[PDB]
Amino acid sequence: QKSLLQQLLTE
Amino acid sequence: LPQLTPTLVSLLEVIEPEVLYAGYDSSVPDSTWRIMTTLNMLGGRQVIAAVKWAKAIPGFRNLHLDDQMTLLQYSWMSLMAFALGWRSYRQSSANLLCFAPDLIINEQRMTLPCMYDQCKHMLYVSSELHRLQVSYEEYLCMKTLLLLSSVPKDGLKSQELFDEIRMTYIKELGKAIVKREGNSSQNWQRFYQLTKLLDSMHEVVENLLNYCFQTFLDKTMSIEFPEMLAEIITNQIPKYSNGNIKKLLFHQK
Numbered sequence: 450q451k452s453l454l455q456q457l458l459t460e
Numbered sequence: 461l462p463q464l465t466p467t468l469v470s471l472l473e474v475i476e477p478e479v480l481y482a483g484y485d486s487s488v489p490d491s492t493w494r495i496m497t498t499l500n501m502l503g504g505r506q507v508i509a510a511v512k513w514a515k516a517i518p519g520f521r522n523l524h525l526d527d528q529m530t531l532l533q534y535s536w537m538s539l540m541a542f543a544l545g546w547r548s549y550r551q552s553s554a555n556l557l558c559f560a561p562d563l564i565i566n567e568q569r570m571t572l573p574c575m576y577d578q579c580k581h582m583l584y585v586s587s588e589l590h591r592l593q594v595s596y597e598e599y600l601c602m603k604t605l606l607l608l609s610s611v612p613k614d615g616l617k618s619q620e621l622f623d624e625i626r627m628t629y630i631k632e633l634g635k636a637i638v639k640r641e642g643n644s645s646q647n648w649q650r651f652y653q654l655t656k657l658l659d660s661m662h663e664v665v666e667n668l669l670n671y672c673f674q675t676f677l678d679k680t681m682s683i684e685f686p687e688m689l690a691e692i693i694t695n696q697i698p699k700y701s702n703g704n705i706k707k708l709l710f711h712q713k
């Protein structure tokens with residue numbers, strides 16, 4: 450998926 | 461000589477996210493509703509800036525990515541209120557809320573129809589920082605502790621490592637006290653007072669969160685929240701209720 454937060458925690 | 465030998469505190473000082481500007485259309489309004497929408501928008505950016513900051517904290521990312529999420533979703537309002545409080549404190553001799561260098565809520569706007577009840581809590585942390593004359597270093601540590609101030613009732617998936625980090629920063633805050641001037645009896649009282657302040661943040665967070673949740677779910681009001689922030693809120697409202705949230709307190713007082 451994406452989950453804005455989760456995605457930033459891996460950006 | 462030193463400076464070239466990094467200290468936990470000197471590192472906290474450099475990862476501190478830089479000041480954001482509001483964008484604007486600076487003729488800044490009187491409608492309580494526009495203020496909120498505007499602040500919610502800036503808030504979204506402010507939170508992303510904070511997440512990045514969390515990832516730069518020594519030991520933070522060495523936690524299960526799941527705990528890194530739980531933490532940020534439990535403490536964002538806290539990190540937000542504390543940083544806004546500090547910026548408001550260092551900004552002026554008193555009375556205001558400094559959200560950005562190009563976005564300030566003064567005495568006038570602060571008292572528009574539905575503003576004061578929301579802002580008074582934000583002014584609180586600002587007055588507290590002033591009252592106790594908190595140093596920049598004390599604040600850098602306290603703010604880190606705030607990120608680690610709420611764990612799930614049923615622990616984390618890195619409990620051990622968490623406990624070790626939380627303590628590292630508690631001791632780190634102790635040092636910042638020893639440094640600010642140099643007493644011995646006051647060091648105790650001083651540590652008692654700051655841990656007290658940290659403990660009271662859960663309370664202001666609780667007040668600010670009610671308005672945040674009430675406002676987000678209304679749809680009779682229709683107040684805009686940015687995409688990511690909206691997600692975190694929809695995600696936390698169910699848990700914040702059930703008592704699945706545990707607040708670490710320095711004083712059972």
Ligand SMILES: CC1=C[C@@H]2[C@H]([C@@H](O)C[C@@]3(C)[C@H]2C[C@@H](C)[C@]3(O)C(=O)CO)[C@@]2(C)Cc3cnn(-c4ccccc4)c3C=C12
Binds near residue numbers: 504537540547683
């Ligand atoms: C604390 C703090 C509380 C939030 C505020 C806005 O979202 C509007 C909220 C949710 C308010 C609590 C709630 C009552 C609220 O008034 C509403 O319910 C409106 O619907 C926000 C995120 C926005 C913002 C833009 N800047 N920045 C900021 C700047 C420098 C350091 C820290 C933060 C801040 C700090 C914020």
